[PDB]
Design a protein around this nucleic acid. Sequence first.
RNA 1: CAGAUCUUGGUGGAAGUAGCAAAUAUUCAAAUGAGAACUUUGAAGACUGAAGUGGGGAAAGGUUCCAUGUGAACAGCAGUUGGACAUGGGUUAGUCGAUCCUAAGAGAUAGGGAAGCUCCGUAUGAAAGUUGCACGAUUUUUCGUGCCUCCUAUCGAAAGGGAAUCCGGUUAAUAUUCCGGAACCAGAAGGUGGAAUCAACACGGCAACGUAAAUGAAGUUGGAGACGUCGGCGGGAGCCCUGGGAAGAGUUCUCUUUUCUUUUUAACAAACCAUUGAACUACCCUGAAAUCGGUUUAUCCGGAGCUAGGGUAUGGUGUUUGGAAGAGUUCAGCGCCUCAUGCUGAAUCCGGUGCGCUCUCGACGGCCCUUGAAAAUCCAACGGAAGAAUGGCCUUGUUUUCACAUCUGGUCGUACUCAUAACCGCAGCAGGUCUCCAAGGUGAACAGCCUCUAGUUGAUAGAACAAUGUAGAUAAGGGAAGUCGGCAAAAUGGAUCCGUAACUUCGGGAUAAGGAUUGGCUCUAAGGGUUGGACAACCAACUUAGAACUGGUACGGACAAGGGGAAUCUGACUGUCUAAUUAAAACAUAGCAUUGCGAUGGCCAGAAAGUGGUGUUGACGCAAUGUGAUU
Lengths: 50, 106, 248, 69, 93, 93
Amino acid sequence: PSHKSFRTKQKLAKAARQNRPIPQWIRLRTGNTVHYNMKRRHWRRTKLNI
Amino acid sequence: AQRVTYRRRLAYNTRSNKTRIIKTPGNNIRYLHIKKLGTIPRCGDTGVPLQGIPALRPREFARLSHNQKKVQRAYGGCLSANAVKDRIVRAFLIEEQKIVKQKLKQ
Amino acid sequence: GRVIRAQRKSGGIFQAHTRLRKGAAQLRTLDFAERHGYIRGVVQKIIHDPGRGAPLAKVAFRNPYHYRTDVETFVATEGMYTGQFVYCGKNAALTVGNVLPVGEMPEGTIISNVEEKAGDRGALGRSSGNYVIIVGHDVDTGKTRVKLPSGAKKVVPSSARGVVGIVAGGGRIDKPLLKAGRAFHKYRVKRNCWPRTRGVAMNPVDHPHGGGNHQHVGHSTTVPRQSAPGQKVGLIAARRTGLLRGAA
Amino acid sequence: PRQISDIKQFLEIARRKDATSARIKKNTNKDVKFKLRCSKYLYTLVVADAKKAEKLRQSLPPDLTVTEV
Amino acid sequence: TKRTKKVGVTGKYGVRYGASLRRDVRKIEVQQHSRYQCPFCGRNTVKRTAAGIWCCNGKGCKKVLAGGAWTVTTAAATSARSTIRRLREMVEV
Amino acid sequence: THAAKRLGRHTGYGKRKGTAEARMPSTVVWMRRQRVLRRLLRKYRESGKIDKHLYHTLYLEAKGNTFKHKRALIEHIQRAKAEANRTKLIQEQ
RNA sequence: CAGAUCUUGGUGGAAGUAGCAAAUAUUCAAAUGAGAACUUUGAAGACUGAAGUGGGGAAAGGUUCCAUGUGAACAGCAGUUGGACAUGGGUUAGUCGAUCCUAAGAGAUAGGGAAGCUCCGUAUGAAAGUUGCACGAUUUUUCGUGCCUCCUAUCGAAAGGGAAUCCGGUUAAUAUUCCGGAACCAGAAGGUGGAAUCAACACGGCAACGUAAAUGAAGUUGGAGACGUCGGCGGGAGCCCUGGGAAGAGUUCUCUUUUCUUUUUAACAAACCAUUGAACUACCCUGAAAUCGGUUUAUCCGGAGCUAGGGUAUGGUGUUUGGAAGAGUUCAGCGCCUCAUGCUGAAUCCGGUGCGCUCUCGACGGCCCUUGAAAAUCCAACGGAAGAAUGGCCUUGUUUUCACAUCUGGUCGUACUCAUAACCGCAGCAGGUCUCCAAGGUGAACAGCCUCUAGUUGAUAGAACAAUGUAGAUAAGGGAAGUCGGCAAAAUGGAUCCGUAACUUCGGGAUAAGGAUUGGCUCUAAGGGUUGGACAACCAACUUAGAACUGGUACGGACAAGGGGAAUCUGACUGUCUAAUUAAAACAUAGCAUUGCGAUGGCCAGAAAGUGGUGUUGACGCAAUGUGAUU
Ligand SMILES: [Zn+2]
């Protein structure tokens, strides 16, 4: 609410960083099945719950 | 007409959210947040405000010089002139009667 | 069943509202000055205590041991005024507003804020318009017989202190409240005890009086004194019931 | 901002340590304002006559940096 | 104009609360809002406050009297003061 | 339209939706009249046309709703002064 | 395995079916694009109509904010577009908040219970020390004793208290934070200047009291912080309204010296301040008042000293200035790729008004069996601890509560939405969610209606009006004959002038019931302000009442906006409840009556407790009941 604690802001920074696309060269590794995942979080679909 | 908004994140009409409408040198009507009015010190014996002392917030008195917070008289800045006069007369009369009672007790 | 309202009044939301109250109305600590001579204080304030009908008196005394002044909270006696000099001690004069031992006062005097024991700082006759009458004395094993506002006769040691006069506030209960609003405002600054729901208007789970196709108790409202909590409702250990057609 | 009434005090303030600079302002009504920028305050002196303004400018200390607006 | 026959100050209560209760409140309200003489000043400038506080207006005798809920002095207090004075005068000798 | 209303148009009973007190309070009308009457009385007292004995009486009548306007007050003052002067002439002669 | 309204998964008929219909509404042209009803631009028509579909915040969300691209999934139609997708960028504080203080409360410690998890307990049955004082101390000073006095853990408010910042400009996105200018506060040393003291701590005024300073330790006392609600009155600021001048723009068959926009001045600093507007508001001096006087809209004051005269204080959102025209705004030109988007001309002026709106201030009044926080912090007083400059002149300390000057002010938050799409409700849901500002006209009005600023034109679209629907209207004659029942609808409705019954607790009933008028235009009379020599030419004003004339015999012309009466049962009344089928005669209420209890107590609580509530209480009190105004 524009009035956030330091811990809350760091958690928001971590959440925004986690919600990023996975590079293709990562999926290209031999024997890897990291191509797609459902961990993508949108600000309107799934809430962070603090 | 121009409509104004609070200059701070406090969005309620509290006693700490006193505002005054001002007109700037840009033809802009906007709020100006102001503090509460000061209070004149009161007499310790009668409770009346003390003459010759400005009305200021409690910490605003620290910036004043000594003479501006005091009246040049005994108990000046703590008691009114009438209260001081009554105390002087009462003290003198009671001491005189105490002397009379002591002398007459023999 | 269910825990009744009387059992639920053990605290919490049923505590007294004491934010606006100014302090306890204790007389003073029984010290050397009051035990042997007298001490002079000046009534500097007569104020209103929220939740109390009688006014309170702020009286400033002089500390006999340290360079200091002590402010007391006497129960205001009718006729007292700010700037009055009150005297507390054994050698104090029989004047309204002074605090004297009960054994140093004649028979038939009207007093207030009377101590049950010497040093408890006032127990008897503190509500507005109430007073205690000194009935008699007994020098051997010094004890004073007094008459309480309820008509009871109590024997106290002849060293308990009392204030000469009557508690200020006059007759307050003579005026009808005249509406629930006045009753609401009266008990708002006292506690959470108003309004009151009748037991017969409840369900059997809530109160012993609840239930039935008609609002009725169904059993004698007079309950024994040795009744367990939860059933000690109605008239507890009633000696007699009905209109008090002649009593003394 | 403070205003100076007498010219003497204006020269005295100019003859100090905090007198970093001065500014000359010419108004539409042929009024001249002499402003001294000190450490805490800006001191302004108003001269309504050109002759007195010229004499004041000539009497200003040489070490003072005077700038026209 | 008389403007009212019976209710007087009570007329603010309308037709509710009962006539007898309204009259009983009326008498006490008149006592509560009546002026009284200051025994130390003499002016009829004594007003009630908080049902027991009585203050005198003016530049003099700014004292506060502890009285009754609706009157400055009640009969019980007057009788108590009289008997206390009699007991004191008979015990001094 | 405002100019027409200033002349006196669009004012009749068919153009009024609020009560007379709502459109113009009687309290304000009485306040204006009392201030005007008291100002006139003070001016006459300062100018010496009336004395303090007559000024006090006229002040009480003005508070008592005796004079409808300035003309009524002036007429009453004129009659009082004329009667006082005539009685003074009779006493002197 | 054929079943178990079996389990999991997948997939059918219904079926291209129900449906995608609340919130007035869109149209033309151009651009882009393969593709345009949804994108953008221009034009037109409309809506929200300031209690907004406007501009901000609190909670909540967390990057949704901005720029550039994409149109696979979502945006129940579409998509060139999006709060979607992808890549980058963006939140700058001594002055705004948190941080500091305390409230309701939470909670260690001492101590006591409990098998124990843990419970009670917050100066409590504690050896609970932070502070006051020169004794050593060269010689001009915070370092080891001694004697000491009711101190004390902390957490707890982004709406309580509180040290201090304003203007203009700047970004794609931040600003009271950045830039330019101009200030303020706190802390630290003492860098200067000033003041008093020749032999220690100033003067003036009768006084209220005033000053550029005007030495003050412990201890104590006082004040500020610091306070309810309602009503009227007076003032100020902003807004609104109105008369001229200037600049630009709109209309111009005709008329309109016309209509519209701008005409601005912050924090801070100085001097006055009842003058210009608002207190003889409080106090002081002279003086002594009845033929009592003064005085508010409101009846308060005065030998406890009125009126009157003269002073002292309270002082800004008041006046004159500085800031500050150098800013901002409007208009008119030059270059003409123009580069720093520069340079050059003018105006930004003079007046007025108020039962007007919002905020605020001042003096008052009414009400309480309701009297309407605490603390941090700051200031003042009583008091007298301590001082040493010397040679009437070359020589010190104090003040740093006097003026100028120096240094420092750390950490965290700062984007954006705040909602008919950024929160919750499974969602981009007609629901719910605290609060700030609030133009003109009509009108009593924050009512309804239209409009200005601002915002939006977003709710899948096209064609046609079948039955039956939903919502809105009308209807000859009768007028409740319908129906359990006047359900629904209709009728009444504003204002002014007449008139108003039974009954009653005398307060009401009551707007009882029942009648008349209402437009426009032209006048008449009365009711108030300053002001030039009985008066007076203006300027600046709003009401009321009446008359004539006139037309649709019409006029609260839309909107807005009581149907009324006669009885019975019941509850006295105001109020409260079954969130999501029952709002009532149910509950509560004031009133009435009864019961227990004088503290070694009544009632309640706890496993126990050196335990808690009533109780900051004491019979006019607390606790437990029944009945339910008055008579
Ligand atoms: Zn008196």
